[PDB]
């Protein structure tokens, strides 16, 4: 079942509370849509009314924080079209080789902040290098990650 870290919850909390200083603990579904497109996704009116139907049987027009968080978690959870996968690899690779060197991974790790060890990084490289060429192509990245 989808989950995200307590620090991710804290960040989402700051997002919610800045989204309106009015301290209501509930905010407009329209602003939820503005949030999603600020993340980079502009869902269509069918998805707008679908999510509204989730949030607001009563029709306040408002998520509470737990709805905001749970719908965020779900929309975070699913798989993307290839464009976003390419974006991911292009950020992972700034050697511009189409290869995730161990350097590329290690910098991405230092950027995100999780301190996972060098053998663990090299092992997820090794399994992610689905063709075993020495590191992971964007092809090999696709091949593992689409699974």
């Amino acid at each position: 079942k989808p989950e995200l870290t307590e620090d991710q919850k804290q960040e989402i909390r700051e997002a919610f509370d800045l989204f309106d200083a009015d301290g209501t603990g509930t905010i407009d579904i329209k602003e939820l849509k503005v949030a999603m497109r600020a993340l980079g996704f502009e869902p269509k009116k069918e998805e707008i009314k679908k999510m509204i139907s989730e949030i607001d049987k009563e029709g306040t027009g408002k998520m509470n924080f737990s709805d905001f968080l749970t719908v965020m978690t779900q929309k975070m959870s699913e798989k993307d079209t290839k464009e976003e996968i390419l974006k991911a690899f292009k950020l992972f690779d700034d050697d511009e080789t189409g290869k995730i060197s161990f350097k590329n991974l290690k910098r991405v790790a230092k950027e995100l902040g999780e301190n996972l060890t060098d053998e663990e990084l090299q092992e997820m490289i090794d399994e992610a290098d689905r063709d075993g060429d020495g590191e992971v192509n964007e092809q090999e990245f696709l091949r593992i990650m689409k699974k």
């Binding site: 060890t117 060098d118 053998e119 663990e120 092992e123």
Partner: protein, 368 residues
């Protein structure tokens, strides 16, 4: 539900989680003053992170060490807090799996079984011996275990999923002994890091910065001649530390216990002794399948040095492979949670009605 008395770092997860939801330090606090100083003293109990944060008003011990449950009440406190805070549940909804060190005296084994059954509501339950399920994480039924960095340092040869009780022995060094030697060599170097804060900083240093020399005499002469092999570290106070021979001298104590002054054969030769104790037919499988575990193994270079050293001890006919799970400081928890996931394992448990007549005898028996 999965429960670990991990004596360097204790841990908990629901069964078949991918990781222990909760990880927590092997301590419970008592108020250090005998009176309640202020309303913070709502309990006399401060399990885990509570002690770590609040040390100064609290009484401080690792409740267990080495081979046994030591101090049953304080362990029961730890387990109670594990269920209610850390697992955040009343457990009795689901079976619970628990850890014990190898060759735990049967008296303790039943005493624990009783304590868990009577003190905690439970459907069915089992305690497992850290080596056996640690080997399950390897995937072998047939393997010798090493573990260091979460307990005293065991050797355990295992055939088809069970030990040779004939061949269980400790090396009486734990995570503290590594910190002790490292504090010695730091004080020689002049850092003299020994205060409880310095002690924690040095435990961080030893956890991340240790490495095991491939051939210690050569690596030590290399680093002492070529200080390019000794590497810099930033202290929380902005000092820079340089760490060099210390990086591998500290793990070398496992190979030369006399380095920490211990009159023992090294981990390699005591492993070789353990193997020799068993059937040569098993011995070949143990040389084929060695598993090493615990925070001390997590380091770089340990498994390569160990592979070389066992090859030096092992007969030239033997194939040698150290198996080094990247997670191996959790091996037991991984194996236990995986095994407990299986609904076919559900028949293996012991539950209330059989627990009455059978349970004292039947758990003692199923615990092997």
């Amino acid at each position: 539900l999965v429960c670990d008395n991990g004596s360097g770092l204790c841990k908990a997860g629901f069964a078949g989680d991918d990781a222990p939801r909760a990880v927590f330090p092997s301590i419970v606090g008592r108020p250090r003053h005998q009176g309640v100083m202020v309303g913070m003293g709502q309990k006399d109990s401060y399990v885990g992170d509570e002690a770590q944060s609040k040390r100064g008003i609290l009484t401080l011990k690792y409740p267990i060490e080495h081979g046994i449950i030591t101090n049953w009440d304080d362990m029961e406190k730890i387990w109670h807090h594990s269920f209610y805070n850390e697992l955040r549940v009343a457990p009795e909804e689901h079976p619970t799996l628990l850890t014990e060190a190898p060759l735990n005296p049967k008296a303790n084994r039943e005493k624990m079984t009783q304590i868990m059954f009577e003190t905690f509501n439970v459907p069915a339950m089992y305690v497992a011996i850290q080596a056996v399920l640690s080997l399950y994480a390897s995937g072998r039924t047939t393997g010798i275990v090493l573990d260091s960095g979460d307990g005293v340092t065991h050797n355990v040869p295992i055939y088809e999923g069970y030990a040779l009780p004939h061949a269980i022995m400790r090396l009486d060094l734990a995570g503290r002994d590594l910190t002790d030697y490292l504090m010695k060599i730091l004080t020689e170097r002049g850092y003299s890091f020994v205060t409880t804060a310095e002690r924690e900083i040095v435990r961080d240093i030893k956890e991340k910065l240790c490495y095991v020399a491939l051939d210690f005499e050569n690596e030590m002469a290399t680093a002492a001649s070529s200080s390019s092999l000794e590497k810099s570290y930033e202290l929380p106070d902005g000092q820079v530390i340089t760490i060099g021979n210390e990086r591998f001298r500290c793990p070398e104590t496992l190979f030369q216990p006399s380095f920490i002054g211990m009159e023992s054969a090294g981990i390699h030769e005591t492993t070789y002794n353990s193997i020799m104790k068993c059937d040569i037919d098993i011995r070949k499988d143990l040389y084929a399948n060695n598993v090493l575990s615990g925070g001390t193994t997590m380091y770089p270079g340990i498994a390569d040095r160990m592979q070389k050293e066992i090859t030096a001890l092992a007969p030239s006919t033997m194939k040698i492979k150290i198996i080094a799970p990247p997670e191996r400081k959790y091996s037991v928890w991984i194996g236990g949670s995986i095994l407990a996931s299986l609904s076919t394992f559900q028949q293996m448990w012991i539950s209330k009605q059989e627990y009455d007549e059978a349970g004292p005898s039947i758990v003692h028996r199923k615990c092997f």
